[PDB]
Design an enzyme around this catalytic site. Structure first.
Site, PDB file in Angstrom:
ATOM      1  N   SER A 114       0.845  -1.219   0.000  1.00 57.61           N
ATOM      2  CA  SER A 114       0.000   0.000   0.000  1.00 57.61           C
ATOM      3  C   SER A 114       0.872   1.259   0.000  1.00 57.61           C
ATOM      4  O   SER A 114       0.755   2.064  -0.946  1.00 57.61           O
ATOM      5  CB  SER A 114      -0.934   0.002   1.186  1.00 57.61           C
ATOM      6  OG  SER A 114      -1.584  -1.254   1.329  1.00 57.61           O
TER       7      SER A 114
ATOM      8  N   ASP B  19      -0.303   6.465   4.565  1.00 54.92           N
ATOM      9  CA  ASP B  19      -1.188   5.342   4.145  1.00 54.92           C
ATOM     10  C   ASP B  19      -1.850   4.715   5.374  1.00 54.92           C
ATOM     11  O   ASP B  19      -1.226   4.601   6.428  1.00 54.92           O
ATOM     12  CB  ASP B  19      -0.427   4.318   3.291  1.00 54.92           C
ATOM     13  CG  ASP B  19      -0.985   2.902   3.332  1.00 54.92           C
ATOM     14  OD1 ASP B  19      -2.054   2.670   2.735  1.00 54.92           O
ATOM     15  OD2 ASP B  19      -0.347   2.038   3.961  1.00 54.92           O
TER      16      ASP B  19
END
Lengths: 239, 204, 276, 206, 229, 244, 229, 219
Positions: free
Chosen positions: H129, H166
């Site tokens: 991610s 993130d």
């Protein structure tokens, strides 16, 4: 897998490995079938009442399906494979066709299986002669004998195992077509007593009637054995 | 969702030389209830308890497997399986069916009988082990239970304290879940003794 | 390579599988094992190999699942073996799987007649198909089931199994059968079956006393069931008495063996009085 | 869903009831198709799906239990057993090429002591089973549209201790509630009870 | 022994196991067929081991289809497996081509099984005599263990097969009545078989050219043949 | 019966495998390999009695992978076939592990292949002694250090400082062993090592060899690829053996 | 392709082809193990055929996995099959149970492969005794395995040529107290008896289980123990 | 997840977040994403945690077995090629996104194996991610022949981008220095996200939660 040819012809046209499976029957324990008007009687000899063998009852006449029972002679181990193959076949049948499979059908299966073994690479033959009795759904009683060759025949009365020819040569003298439940049992034991030990504790036997299987208790039996061993003292006095 | 179908929730919780695992009692198909006497805990040995959550079919199938594997261990190895192994055996079993998975989320509690250290494992359906010091949860109440357990739970708790926050967690979450409740069966494992409690909750 | 085939899976001219008849002769060289089916439990008493001073015990955390002679097949089914140990382990492991594959499916303990039939269809196979030697191992399964209670079963390389009340396999199986026949009666306490099994073992291997070092004993019996956990499966019924196959320790065996020492002594003071 | 099975378990009998309705799309063929098969002397299964999977599953079980009674010299296997065998068969089916047997069973029996030595459950056993293999022991269960009407009506009335006679009165109310409240004309019900004595076919209720 | 393999030639060119399986037929029951234009006959001594045997059971002759019978000799067990294959083929033909199988084709389909030995350990120890009625008229064929399917006008296989071929060369003429063929068939069996001939001791069975159907003759009907003799 | 299948005799010897070691002696070809400090040689006899036989074609020593050279001794065709198994093996490795097969593994994998033929009845042990030679990167510093590995028909893998295989392998080992007591044998220059190998070849068969009657293989730390040596450079060693 | 069993029973009862494979495992160079309270040591003599054979390339003692090694007698080629199997069983166990395999289980799986190669078709038995030594939760184990499949646990034993006289010498020396540094001494003294010529770091390999790891002794660590005896 | 490698002069430094998610939940705050492949080879894993663990183990095993056969330290190329061939055979269904760092004889080696079986042998890498945020910090600060200290402080920095910027990455930075000689796995090299507000101990005294039934069993 090991599919070398075991069952093969010899110079004289004999299948040796089947002659030798039939020799394993001749040494095995004697068993006897008797068809009557209304009743089949399969009567086997047991190895004889050792004090150790479980007092809880082990039956030498195996149920294949409700209607059909079979006594064997030869290799216990092998017979127990035929019976579990037959037992399986009778329920594989009930699934495919709503019918309960009739005796003359199941015999022709078990026989077919005993044949496969005399012609399979890898297998020796089943060292098992098999006396299947039972009733069709229609009401007719049937008695059959499967010998290890695979060849099945239906009889009015029959023996397998030790001194099988001595019993059959005795039976076909004294047998009568129409017989009652009591005459059949009397005759089955009478025939078995030709070869088996004088004792009444070795002989176990089963009386099939339509929808009604019953093994004789050692109380019910020793009435018929005293009644018969007095008749083998009447046939000993004449000669 | 196939996981949420049969419903249920399970939760385990580590104290000092003890853990409390605690299931709900409900078994459903979607919203309709079948039974309210279906605790999801199984007991492998003295020192391991594992709950299964997800499709009940597979809870039952995959349980019968784990039972077949942990018995075959107990005969061959001649000893009780340890948490560590048991949990990693389960991940192997789940991941064997990566493609065509068992719809089950095994929560495992365990406790080394010698050391007294607790081991927890919350495997997802394809055998992704999550082995935290504190507590673990799974099934339909999972979001709600993380909320509860995070607030209430402190490190070095004693069996009785722990049970009361494990029970209050499982209950106060199954109030806010359609697909869990009808009380709860907790199970407080210590090196010493294993206390199985049936907790009274809502009938909802 | 067809030239050098022994042809194991064949009849002989007299109508007898030679490789089996021989594998039987291989079991009459093994250590003697005596089973005794009582009403309070079952007993296996087995003759271990004379212990070399350097032999260790693989320090197994669970004692009761395996020893030298006796192996647990599942909670409710023990067994002793005679013959090729290597083969016994092969089948034992197959029997263990079979009694659990039953439990997996039916979620109840396997009957003993059921396992004894599965274990002996596996042994028959090797006498009929596959051109390999048969398993040269006689089993002596003991178990309890709801159907027939405490059962004992002799097995054979041939496949043929028979149930017994008390049986022997191994070094002097013929001598043991003569001695068991004489002293076995249908009502019998576990302590009276233990006695018999050690007296017959003591007489076969031909010792004055029962040498604790050279005999193992195993006991299939029912004990109170502790681990109920009734609250985890409310509708499931857990029996009061569950069967528990135990192998006896050297100390747990001592008072039973010191009684078979004194029942040999009391029969040797009766043999000193028959002559008078 | 069309065809309602009902069952409930009391002190000393299980009662089972199954729709007579045999349907081809929206057409009543008959109201006289017995869906409660008898697997044993003391065990029966109210199966309710499409005729194909219903028969080929209750036959497969009924044969593989008869096959076990042969190989186990006349020994009558427990209810726990056959229930667990039925579900293990149903479960095996949802991960085969064939797909799920699409049948919702209410398996019922009466465990009697099989010999002297039996310590196991004496008395009646009812198990609810989904097509997936969700086995579950229950006091009372149902399958079909009618299920949820009866399930709640039993919650209300069903006690564990009622007679054979109060079970006819109750099973009439359970059947009459499916008649009143479901559009699908489940107008005749085959009701069979399991007791210590065996299966008896209750003709009084329908 | 097992010294020679199965698929092994002698120094004079015959496969051994076949040459041997052929000597297995010469022990078996005598069985024979008579191709008359009116229809074809098959007759077989049953050679019952005892009185007791239900004679209708151990049938030497077998319906293969409406229009084809087989009679066997040698290993009866093995013959069941040939005839069973022949039946399935006869019906596969009916299934596929909405018509009776030829007799020729049914005999070919019975030697499609008798060659494949090396899948099976040995050849079948059986000679079939297949007889039926199709568009060619009434035909009689013989299979061996070899696989050599041979149309005959009249053949006997089994015990006194060689003694019966002696009689055929004398008595058989192509233009026979079905009645003459039955009379011959039973005349031969009497001279050749070991036991005294009874209605139960043999089976006779004919396929008539007119209707193209198999009739197995009951002991009443076989007594009608022994009558006119 | 003990002799014609791969089964133990009463004295615990697989007779078929003793009889494959005889199939290494039978052709009358002797090879000698020798590790030095920075390189490996493998010297083979290359006898073409026919004047018509093309010398080029008949080789003992094949390349197995660029870094590992074989040198089969025994039934040429069994040799030829092992080399193919060895290439198959070394390509299988190259694909699955993405590096060149280390010679020590290659040898040990061919060891296990030759073992399988001594265990499964009805396979004939390959009547040949594989003599794999190649550099092998020591993971301590990064240096290429020379290696010899013999497989034999038993399946017995072993490393070698030097080694012989074939007709007179006893007398050629006797010569190398006597010349291991004088020198170190792993502190030798490629030239010195060759002279010892080609003197062992000479001592053993009992005759002075030509540069045509031997072919010589080679790997060096400088040039780790398995080279055949040209007949020019072999003649500078056979002149240098005849002198000293 | 030869699927028939090589190992059968003699009329005496014995499996002859295993007695002979056990005779093959009794022939190779001596190897021996000695279990202490706090570890085990297995040592073997790698007597090389000539001085030219690189000593470091020979391996008479193998790591099966971190926590268990073995040695062997008899056919080295065969042994290297049981070892490469075992090494897999030790990983395949780790992968499943995230745990070093118990020696008890490791030896039962080696035992099972010895057994397969008695019963199974067209294979002879292995001609090697293993001497597995390792450490689990259940303490320290030495185990002999044989060609039969039979495995014993031992406090100390030997296999190979000197093994009747090495097990005679090991019985006198061995006490239950014996600690690992006194065991390595006792093990090397046992080899030294049956040895002809001096022992060196190139002549023997010593492996030892200590703490919770097996390790082979580097030629430095062996020289330290060879300077005391 | 965000995982990172850099090549520094002596060896490799791997980095990982620790937050293991189930959907939009934190199952474990401290999970270890830097697995042991070999003594000289570590292997960070993003993507499906199951697949990353299973592939990683199957290879770490295969290498350990092969490290006996050879008697040699496992080469990073070997480890790479086993992850490749395995991940390729499953067409990326096995959704393991690996960073495989190590140091063999040849020198520092640092690859990515994308789930499909793509390989990028590079000097500094990222997966998961937060990769993109990390690879920003890495592209800005990375230079050749960093010291072990610079290279950790960079990796840490690059994880901390993914951790904050993130969601799926979070908690703490695990860092692992594989050098030629050894493998230092520092767990919580950096704890940026400490405790904000101390835990308000709610006191539920024994006998609070009502209990219908109880069963004690002693051992």
């Amino acid at each position: 897998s090991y599919d070398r040819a075991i069952t093969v012809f010899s110079p004289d046209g004999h299948l040796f490995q089947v002659e030798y499976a039939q020799e394993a029957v001749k040494k095995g324990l004697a068993a006897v079938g008797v068809l009557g008007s209304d009743s089949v009687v399969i009567a086997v000899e047991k190895k004889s009442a050792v004090k150790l063998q479980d007092s809880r009852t082990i039956r030498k006449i195996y149920k294949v399906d409700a209607n059909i029972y079979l006594a064997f002679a030869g290799l216990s181990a092998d017979a127990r494979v035929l019976i579990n193959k037959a037992q399986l076949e009778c329920q594989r049948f009930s699934l495919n066709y709503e019918d309960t499979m009739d005796v003359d059908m199941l015999v022709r299966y078990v026989a077919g299986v005993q044949q496969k073994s005399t012609q399979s690479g890898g297998s020796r033959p089943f060292g098992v002669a098999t006396v299947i009795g039972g009733f069709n759904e229609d009401g007719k009683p049937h008695l059959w004998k499967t010998d290890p060759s695979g060849m099945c025949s239906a009889w009015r009365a029959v023996a397998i195992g030790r001194h099988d020819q001595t019993v059959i040569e005795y039976m076909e003298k004294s047998y009568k077509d129409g017989m009652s439940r009591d005459e059949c049992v009397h005759f089955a034991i009478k025939s078995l007593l030709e070869v088996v030990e004088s004792g009444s504790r070795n002989i176990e036997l089963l009386v099939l009637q339509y929808k009604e299987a019953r093994y004789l208790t050692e109380e019910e039996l020793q009435k018929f054995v005293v009644e018969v061993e007095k008749e083998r003292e009447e046939e000993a006095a004449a000669k | 969702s196939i996981m949420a179908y049969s419903g249920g929730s399970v939760m385990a919780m580590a104290g000092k030389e003890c853990f409390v695992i605690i299931s709900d009692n409900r078994l459903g198909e979607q919203l309709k209830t079948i039974s309210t006497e279906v605790p999801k805990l199984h007991v492998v040995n003295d020192s391991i308890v594992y709950g299964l959550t997800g499709l009940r079919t597979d809870q039952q199938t995959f349980a019968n497997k784990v039972q077949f594997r942990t018995e075959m261990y107990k005969l061959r190895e001649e000893r009780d399986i340890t948490g560590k192994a048991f949990a990693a055996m389960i991940t192997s079993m789940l991941y064997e069916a990566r493609f065509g998975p068992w719809f089950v989320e095994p929560v495992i509690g365990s406790i080394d009988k010698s050391t007294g250290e607790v081991y927890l494992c919350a495997t997802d359906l394809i055998g992704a082990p999550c082995e935290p010091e504190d507590y673990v949860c799974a099934g339909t109440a999972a979001e709600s239970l993380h909320g509860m357990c995070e607030a209430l739970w402190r490190p070095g708790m004693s069996p009785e304290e722990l049970f009361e926050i494990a029970a209050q967690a499982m209950l106060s979450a199954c109030d806010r879940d359609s697909l869990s409740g009808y009380g709860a069966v907790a199970m407080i494992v210590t090196k010493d003794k294993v206390t199985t409690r049936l907790i009274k909750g809502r009938k909802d | 390579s067809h030239r050098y085939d022994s042809r194991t899976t064949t009849f002989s001219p007299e109508g007898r599988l030679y490789q089996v008849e021989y594998a039987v002769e291989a079991i009459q060289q093994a250590g003697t094992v005596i089973g005794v089916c009582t009403k309070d439990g079952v007993v296996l008493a087995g003759e271990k190999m004379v212990p070399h001073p350097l032999f260790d015990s693989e320090s197994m955390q669970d004692k009761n699942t395996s020893g030298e002679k006796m192996y647990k097949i599942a909670e409710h089914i023990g067994c002793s073996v005679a013959g090729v140990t290597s083969d016994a382990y092969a089948l034992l492991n197959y029997a263990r799987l079979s009694a659990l594959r039953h439990q997996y499916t039916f979620q109840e303990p396997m009957a003993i007649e059921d396992l004894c039939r599965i274990l002996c269809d596996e042994k028959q196979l090797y006498t009929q198909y596959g051109g390999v030697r048969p398993y040269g191992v006689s089993f002596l399964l003991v178990g309890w089931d709801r159907y027939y209670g405490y059962q004992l079963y002799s097995t054979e390389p041939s496949g043929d199994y028979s149930a017994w009340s008390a049986y022997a396999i191994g070094q002097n199986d013929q001598v043991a059968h003569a001695l068991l026949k004489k002293d076995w009666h249908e009502s019998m306490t576990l302590e009276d079956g233990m006695l018999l099994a050690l007296r017959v073992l003591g007489k076969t291997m031909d010792t004055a006393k029962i040498d604790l070092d050279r005999v193992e004993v195993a006991v299939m019996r029912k004990v109170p069931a502790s681990n109920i956990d009734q609250l985890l499966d409310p509708f499931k019924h857990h029996p009061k008495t569950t069967p528990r196959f135990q192998i006896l320790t050297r100390s747990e065996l001592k008072p039973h063996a010191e009684r078979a020492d004194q029942a040999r002594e009391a029969e040797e003071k009766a043999e000193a009085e028959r002559q008078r | 869903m069309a065809e309602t099975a009902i069952a409930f378990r009391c002190k000393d009998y299980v009662m089972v009831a199954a729709a007579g309705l045999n349907a081809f799309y929206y057409i009543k063929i008959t109201d006289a198709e017995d869906k409660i098969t008898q697997l044993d002397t003391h065990q029966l299964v109210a199966c309710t799906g499409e005729n194909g999977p219903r028969v080929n599953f209750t036959e497969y079980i009924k044969c593989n239990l008869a096959l076990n009674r042969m190989r186990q010299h006349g020994r009558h296997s427990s209810c726990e057993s056959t229930a667990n065998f039925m579900r293990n068969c149903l479960a095996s089916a949802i991960r085969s090429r064939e797909g799920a047997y699409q049948v919702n069973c209410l398996f019922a029996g009466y465990d009697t002591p099989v010999s002297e030595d039996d310590d196991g459950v004496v008395g009646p056993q009812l198990f609810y089973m989904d097509y997936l293999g969700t086995l579950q022991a229950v006091p009372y269960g149902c399958h079909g549209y009618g299920a949820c009407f009866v399930t709640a009506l039993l919650d209300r009335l069903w006690r564990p201790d009622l007679s054979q006679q109060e079970g006819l009165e109750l099973m009439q109310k359970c059947c009459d509630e499916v008649k009143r409240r479901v559009i699908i004309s489940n107008s005749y019900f085959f009701v069979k009870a399991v007791t210590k004595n065996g299966v008896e076919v209750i003709t009084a209720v329908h | 022994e097992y010294d020679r393999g199965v698929n092994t030639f002698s120094p004079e060119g015959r496969i051994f196991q076949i040459e041997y399986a052929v000597e297995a037929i010469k022990l078996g029951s005598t069985s024979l067929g008579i191709r008359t234009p009116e229809g074809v006959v098959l007759a077989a001594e049953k050679r019952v081991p005892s009185t007791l045997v239900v004679p209708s059971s151990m049938s030497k002759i077998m319906e293969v289809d409406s229009h084809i019978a087989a009679v066997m000799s040698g290993m009866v067990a093995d013959a069941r497996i040939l005839v069973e294959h022949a039946r399935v083929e006869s019906q596969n033909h009916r299934f596929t081509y909405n018509e009776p199988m030829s007799v020729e084709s049914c005999t070919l389909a019975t030697c499609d099984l008798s060659i494949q030995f090396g899948l099976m350990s040995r050849p079948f120890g059986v000679s079939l005599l297949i007889a039926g009625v199709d568009e060619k008229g009434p035909q009689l064929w013989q299979t061996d263990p070899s696989g050599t399917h041979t149309r005959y006008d009249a053949q006997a296989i089994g015990g006194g097969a060689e003694a019966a071929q002696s009689v055929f060369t004398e008595r058989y003429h192509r233009n026979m009545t079905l009645e003459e063929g039955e009379t011959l068939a039973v005349d031969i069996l009497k001279q050749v078989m070991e036991d005294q001939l009874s209605p139960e001791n043999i089976e006779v069975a004919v396929v008539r050219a007119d209707d193209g159907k198999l009739h197995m003759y009951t002991p009443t009907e076989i007594k009608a043949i022994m009558s006119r003799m | 019966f003990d002799k014609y299948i791969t089964v133990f005799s009463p004295e615990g010897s697989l007779y078929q495998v003793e009889y494959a070691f005889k199939a290494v002696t039978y052709p009358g070809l002797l090879t000698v390999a020798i590790r030095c400090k920075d390189a490996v040689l493998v010297v083979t006899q290359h006898l073409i009695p026919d004047r018509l036989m093309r010398p080029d074609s008949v080789t003992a020593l094949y390349e197995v992978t660029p870094n590992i050279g074989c040198c089969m001794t025994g039934r040429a065709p069994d040799g030829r076939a092992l080399v193919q198994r060895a290439r198959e093996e070394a390509s299988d490795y190259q694909y699955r592990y993405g590096v060149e097969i280390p010679i020590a593994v290659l040898a040990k994998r061919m060891g296990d292949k030759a073992q399988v033929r001594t265990q499964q009845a009805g396979l004939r042990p390959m009547g040949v002694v594989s003599t794999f030679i190649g550099m092998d990167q020591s993971d301590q510093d990064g240096s290429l250090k020379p290696q010899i590995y013999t497989v034999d028909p038993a399946g017995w893998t072993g490393g070698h400082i030097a080694c012989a295989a074939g007709k007179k392998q006893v007398e050629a080992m006797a010569f190398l062993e006597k010349r291991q007591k004088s020198t170190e044998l792993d502190a030798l220059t490629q030239k010195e090592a060759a002279m010892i190998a080609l003197a062992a070849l000479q001592s053993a068969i009992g005759t002075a060899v030509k540069a045509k009657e031997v072919e010589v293989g080679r790997c060096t730390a400088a040039n780790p690829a398995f080279q055949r040596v040209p007949n020019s450079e072999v003649e500078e060693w056979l002149t240098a053996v005849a002198e000293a | 392709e030869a699927f028939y069993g090589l190992t059968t029973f003699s009329p005496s009862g014995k499996l002859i082809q295993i007695e002979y494979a056990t005779t093959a495992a009794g022939k190779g160079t001596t190897a021996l193990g000695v279990k202490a309270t706090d570890g085990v040591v297995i040592a073997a003599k790698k007597k090389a055929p000539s001085t030219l054979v690189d000593a470091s390339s020979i391996q008479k003692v193998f790591v099966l996995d971190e926590h268990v090694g073995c040695t062997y007698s008899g056919m080295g080629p065969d042994c290297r099959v049981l070892i490469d199997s075992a090494r897999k069983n030790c990983q395949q166990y780790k992968l499943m149970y995230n745990e070093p395999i118990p020696i008890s289980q490791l030896v039962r799986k080696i035992s099972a492969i010895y057994q397969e190669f008695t019963q199974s078709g067209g294979v002879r038995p292995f001609g090697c005794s293993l001497l597995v030594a390792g450490v689990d939760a259940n303490g320290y184990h030495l185990y002999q395995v044989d060609p039969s499949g039979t495995f014993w646990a031992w406090k100390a034993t030997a296999i190979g040529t000197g093994s009747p006289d090495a097990k005679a010498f090991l019985e006198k020396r061995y006490t239950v107290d014996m600690e690992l540094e006194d065991a390595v001494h006792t093990a090397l003294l046992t080899l030294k008896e049956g040895f002809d010529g001096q022992m060196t770091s190139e002549n023997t390999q010593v492996g030892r289980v200590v703490e919770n790891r097996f390790e082979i002794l580097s030629v430095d660590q062996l020289r330290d123990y060879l300077d005391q005896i | 997840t965000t995982i990172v490698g850099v090549v520094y002069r002596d060896g490799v430094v791997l980095g990982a977040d620790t937050r293991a998610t189930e959907g939009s939940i934190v199952a474990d705050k401290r999970c270890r994403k830097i697995h042991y492949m070999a003594p000289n080879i570590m292997c960070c894993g993003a993507g499906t945690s199951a697949d990353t663990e299973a592939v990683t183990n199957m290879v770490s095993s295969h290498l350990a077995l092969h490290r006996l056969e050879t008697g040699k330290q496992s080469r990073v190329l070997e480890a790479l090629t086993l992850l490749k061939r395995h991940l390729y055979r499953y067409q990326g269904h096995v959704s393991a996104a690996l960073v495989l760092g190590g140091v063999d004889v040849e020198g520092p080696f640092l690859a990515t194996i994308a789930p499909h079986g793509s390989t990028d042998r590079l000097p500094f890498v990222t997966m998961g991610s937060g990769s993109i945020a990390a690879m920003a910090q890495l592209e800005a600060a990375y230079k050749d022949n960093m010291t072990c200290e610079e290279a950790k402080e960079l990796v840490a920095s690059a994880i901390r981008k993914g951790i904050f910027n993130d969601p799926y990455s979070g908690t703490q930075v695990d860092v692992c220095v594989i050098t030629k000689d050894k493998t230092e796995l520092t767990i919580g090299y950096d704890k940026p996200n400490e405790r904000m507000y101390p835990r308000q101990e709610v006191l539920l005294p024994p006998g609070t939660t009502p209990v219908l039934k109880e069963e004690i069993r002693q051992l």
